[PDB]
Amino acid sequence: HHSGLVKMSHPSGDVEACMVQVTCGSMTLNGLWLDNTVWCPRHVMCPADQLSDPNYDALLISMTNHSFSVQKHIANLRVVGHAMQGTLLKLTVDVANPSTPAYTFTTVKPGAAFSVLACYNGRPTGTFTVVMRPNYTIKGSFLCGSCGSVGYTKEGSVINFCYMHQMELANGTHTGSAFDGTMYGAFMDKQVHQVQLTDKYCSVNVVAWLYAAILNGCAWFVKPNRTSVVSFNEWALANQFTEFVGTQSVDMLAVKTGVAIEQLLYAIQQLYTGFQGKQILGSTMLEDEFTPEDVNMQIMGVV
Amino acid sequence: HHSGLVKMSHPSGDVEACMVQVTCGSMTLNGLWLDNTVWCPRHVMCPADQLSDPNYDALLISMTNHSFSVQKHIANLRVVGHAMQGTLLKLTVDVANPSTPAYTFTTVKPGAAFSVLACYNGRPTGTFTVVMRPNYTIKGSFLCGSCGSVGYTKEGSVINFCYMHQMELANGTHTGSAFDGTMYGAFMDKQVHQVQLTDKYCSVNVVAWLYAAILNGCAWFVKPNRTSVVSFNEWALANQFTEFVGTQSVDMLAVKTGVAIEQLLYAIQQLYTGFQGKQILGSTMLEDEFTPEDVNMQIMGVV
Numbered sequence: 026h027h028s029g030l031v032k033m034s035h036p037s038g039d040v041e042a043c044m045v046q047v048t049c050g051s052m053t054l055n056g057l058w059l060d061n062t063v064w065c066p067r068h069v070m071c072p073a074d075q076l077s078d079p080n081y082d083a084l085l086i087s088m089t090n091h092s093f094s095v096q097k098h099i100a101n102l103r104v105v106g107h108a109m110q111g112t113l114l115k116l117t118v119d120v121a122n123p124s125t126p127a128y129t130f131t132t133v134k135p136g137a138a139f140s141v142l143a144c145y146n147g148r149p150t151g152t153f154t155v156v157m158r159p160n161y162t163i164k165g166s167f168l169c170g171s172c173g174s175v176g177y178t179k180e181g182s183v184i185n186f187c188y189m190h191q192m193e194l195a196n197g198t199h200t201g202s203a204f205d206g207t208m209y210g211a212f213m214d215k216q217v218h219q220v221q222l223t224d225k226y227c228s229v230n231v232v233a234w235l236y237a238a239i240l241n242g243c244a245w246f247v248k249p250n251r252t253s254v255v256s257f258n259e260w261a262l263a264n265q266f267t268e269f270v271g272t273q274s275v276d277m278l279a280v281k282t283g284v285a286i287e288q289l290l291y292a293i294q295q296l297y298t299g300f301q302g303k304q305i306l307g308s309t310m311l312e313d314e315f316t317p318e319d320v321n322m323q324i325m326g327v328v
Numbered sequence: 329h330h331s332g333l334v335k336m337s338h339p340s341g342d343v344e345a346c347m348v349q350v351t352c353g354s355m356t357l358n359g360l361w362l363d364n365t366v367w368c369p370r371h372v373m374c375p376a377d378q379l380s381d382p383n384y385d386a387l388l389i390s391m392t393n394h395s396f397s398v399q400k401h402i403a404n405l406r407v408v409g410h411a412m413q414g415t416l417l418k419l420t421v422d423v424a425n426p427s428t429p430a431y432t433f434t435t436v437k438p439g440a441a442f443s444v445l446a447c448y449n450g451r452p453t454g455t456f457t458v459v460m461r462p463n464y465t466i467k468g469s470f471l472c473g474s475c476g477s478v479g480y481t482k483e484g485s486v487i488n489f490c491y492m493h494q495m496e497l498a499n500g501t502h503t504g505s506a507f508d509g510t511m512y513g514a515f516m517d518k519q520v521h522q523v524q525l526t527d528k529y530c531s532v533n534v535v536a537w538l539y540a541a542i543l544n545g546c547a548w549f550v551k552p553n554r555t556s557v558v559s560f561n562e563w564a565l566a567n568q569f570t571e572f573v574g575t576q577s578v579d580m581l582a583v584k585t586g587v588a589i590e591q592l593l594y595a596i597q598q599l600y601t602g603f604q605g606k607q608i609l610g611s612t613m614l615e616d617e618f619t620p621e622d623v624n625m626q627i628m629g630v631v
Contacts, residue, residue: 027500031335031469036445036452038341142339149339152455166334166626197330197544241500309612323469 028241028306029324030315034140034154035179042124045102046147047116047173048094055144055173056095056116057189059125063095063102063116064204066172066191067109068214077216085109098147111206112214113189126184130204133178133187135159136227136267138316141176141188143167156230156314159267160222161210162198165190176201194221228261228269228293230313235289236278237320238306244284245303251287252294260294274317277327331544331609332627333618337443337457338482345427348405349450350419350476351397358447358476359398359419360492362428366398366405366419367507369475369494370412371517380519388412401450414509415517416492429487433507436481436490438462439530439570441619444479444491446470459533459617462570463525464513465501468493479504497524531564531572531596533616538592539581540623541609547587548606554590555597563597577620580630 047056047065050072056065068076070084070092088107093116095102106117133139135157143151143166155163155176167174167190176188191201191214198221200212212219239247252260258268271286279286293311300309321327350359350368353375359368371379373387373395391410396419398405409420436442438460446454446469458466458479470477470493479491494504494517501524503515515522542550555563561571574589582589596614603612624630 027467029469029500031456031458031467033446033454033456033469034337036341036344036455037339038344038452041339041341143336149341151336152339153334153336155334164330164334166332166336168626168629197332323471326471 026241028237030237032154034152037142037152039126039184040142041149044144044147044149046096049092055147057175058122061117061121063118065114067112067114096147112202112208113206127182128184128186131185131187132203133157136230139176139178139187142174143171144174145170159225162194162200165199167199226266226311227313228266230316231293231311232275232289233317233320234312234315236282237324239282239284240324243305246292246296247284247288250291252290257290272317274321277321329544331540333540335457337455340445340455342429342487343445344452347447347450347452349399352395358450360478361425364420364424366421368417370415370417399450415505415511416509430485431487431489434488434490435506436460439533442479442481442490445477446474447477448473462528465497465503468502470502529569529614530616531569533619534596534614535578535592536620536623537615537618539585540627542585542587543627546608549595549599550587550591553594555593560593575620577624580624
């Protein structure tokens with residue numbers, strides 16, 4: 026039986042119309058064009074043999090407006106101002122993007138899902154959805170030249186930009202910047218080995234998945250036994266789970282299914298030790314890549 | 329270690345600009361507007377209490393051009409001709425879609441991947457990628473009002489439309505039409521319980537996944553033992569696997585990794601009996617949702 030759950034992305038058209046190519050010297054990557062501003066990773070300024078431990082403040086001083094070439098592929102956009110904010114550049118260009126959507130900047134939290142538009146040379150090439158991991162990486166799909174690819178969520182017609190791609194870590198995961206220029210997590214935009222926090226199971230998303238299973242008639246793991254949020258969270262800290270924080274979206278799943286959160290918190294504690302040969306929605310391990318919102322939207326049609 | 333593999337869709341913007349709402353009586357679903365033609369499922373003609381065993385030929389005769397209301401949401405499009413081709417309608421409208429992309433119609437084969445633009449009331453709402461299963465269903469995410477949602481592949485700038493959504497089967501999977509109006513598989517567009525062929529593991533995609541694992545340093549399952557294609561295919565028929573047919577994309581993975589297809593065919597035969605507590609790219613079961621092309625593109629950057 027298929028759960029009706031897929032990795033679903035927002036339609037990407039609004040964001041495709043904002044993607045540009047930025048070139049500075051022998052470096053080329055993607056930028057995001059909104060109003061009269063082009064956002065891009067600051068390491069576009071950096072020569073290759075300096076990518077490890079660059080001095081970006083000196084690089085910035087060395088640049089003029091004419092150092093930066095911005096091209097749209099579907100136009101040259103003339104740069105008329107340049108600034109550095111954290112790990113991003115803010116380039117001011119003479120033409121406002123006539124396809125600028127309604128947008129905000131936001132910061133995405135661990136366990137939360139967002140859509141990524143993967144781009145190369147200013148050209149959108151694919152889209153996918155990821156969850157921000159508890160160690161502030163994402164399990165994405167990015168190659169050389171993908172920096173400046175953007176992540177976003179959507180509420181209504183409004184695009185909430187939350188991620189600009191910067192780097193691949195040694196374990197194959199990825200990280201980037203928020204649009205205030207901070208990197209997610211404790212990462213720096215330098216090509217040096219960095220410590221990676223350990224990842225954890227996102228407990229709220231495992232709960233959501235267990236509810237999706239119940240909504241598909243799969244409930245063998247539901248017992249009357251219960252674990253308090255407080256008790257579960259103490260356990261979580263000792264077993265590489267995030268602490269659980271309920272939301273209105275989780276509450277809706279509890280109401281529709283008639284199964285209490287605390288019953289599924291107990292179930293997780295038991296399922297963690299093992300599935301004993303049974304499966305849940307085709308899986309023999311806990312799944313934390315689907316959010317309560319995904320389950321409410323894709324299975325129940327609920328906002 | 330993360331494989332660098334995600335469920336990747338094409339950017340959807342070209343296709344979003346082709347989506348419309350079609351209404352006929354008290355039925356509303358999505359249509360695809362290309363040139364002067366709007367394609368949509370023929371059951372838009374059907375009243376609710378006739379959805380099981382409708383007589384579409386009579387319904388068609390009963391309709392005039394004015395029976396059909398086509399609306400774009402981002403315009404009313406006046407219908408000036410109507411025809412039925414298999415399980416689709418072809419509506420001719422007075423205005424050619426000025427955003428019509430370069431396109432073809434094609435039929436997608438089992439194991440092959442395509443992108444879906446899920447739409448409601450003519451409004452694109454999400455995108456995801458699926459593989460056509462060996463029993464001509466897809467494991468999608470579709471609700472009431474999603475019919476007329478389209479699937480497609482892309483080569484260059486050319487969009488190859490391959491799927492228009494029609495129905496959900498009892499096991500939660502989905503099926504639809506090709507744009508010649510045939511349903512995939514042996515399904516009919518009637519709301520009656522229908523037999524479903526049994527599904528099978530897509531052997532070529534499991535091979536691709538095993539190569540992805542090797543490309544990520546995970547090769548404990550590779551032995552010098554080998555199984556011929558011919559021998560494997562006899563086995564496959566007895567164990568709910570598709571018969572394996574190699575391609576240039578699989579050959580490229582063999583060359584890059586230095587592991588022969590026949591070594592991985594042997595591995596599959598053994599791994600099918602069990603993983604014995606080991607994992608492959610985080611999984612304890614065979615994965616057939618990634619194609620040789622996905623692996624070549626996402627991991628190696630190869631066309």
